[PDB]
């Protein structure tokens, strides 16, 4: 759209609504240029005296987003407020969004 116009806002909260809670977290990230824009065949032989440490694979120039830890969605006070009052929970939805990019 435009240079001098923000792509999104900072939403970061929690909203308990009965049998559902919606959490929201925003964060700032930085992405390096890995492998100078190349693919490299990474490989290792047996290290530590264990051939189970010997692998063969590929490192790419990409980076990824990982939201697989609880403390990325819950504050310590909203966690506590959950484990003291409920008998269980399970995730229902997800909705990621990337914005306000800046290449330097």
């Amino acid at each position: 759209d435009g240079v001098g116009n923000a792509s999104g806002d900072w939403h970061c909260d929690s909203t308990w609504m009965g049998d559902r809670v919606v959490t929201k977290s925003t964060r700032t990230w930085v992405l390096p240029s890995y492998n100078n824009h190349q693919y490299r065949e990474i490989k290792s032989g047996s290290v530590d005296g264990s051939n189970a440490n010997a692998y063969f694979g590929y490192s790419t120039p990409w980076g990824y987003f990982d939201f697989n830890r609880f403390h990325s969605h819950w504050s310590p006070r909203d966690w506590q407020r959950l484990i003291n009052n409920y008998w269980g929970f399970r995730p229902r939805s997800l909705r990621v969004k990337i914005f306000n990019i800046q290449v330097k």
Partner: protein, 103 residues
């Protein structure tokens, strides 16, 4: 009230109750009131149902708060429960001020 609670202009009415008297064997007139009564007592059930309104807490505190917890060490008995003889035990006075608020 100095003892805590809610001060009310018109508090819950007082509910009184008594056993209507039943005279003993009277056998003659006397303008004097009868004083011989049959001894009686009454038993029954009472159900009281109150409704309360609550004020939800909406704090943006980050770290965890303090809660009232069942923190005993080397329990020889369970609190808030009857002991061997059947007598109800209560070793703590639970108050109400646990959550916090920025003044």
């Amino acid at each position: 009230p100095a003892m805590g609670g809610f001060g009310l202009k018109h508090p819950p009415p007082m509910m009184l109750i008594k056993n209507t008297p039943v005279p003993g064997n009277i056998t003659s007139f006397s303008d004097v009131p009868v004083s011989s009564f049959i001894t009686q007592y009454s038993t029954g059930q009472v159900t009281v149902e109150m409704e309360w309104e609550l004020k939800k807490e909406n704090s943006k505190r980050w770290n965890p708060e303090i809660q009232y917890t069942n923190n005993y060490n080397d329990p020889q008995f369970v609190d808030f429960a009857p002991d061997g003889s059947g007598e109800y035990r209560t070793t703590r006075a639970i108050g109400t001020r646990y959550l916090t608020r920025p003044l």
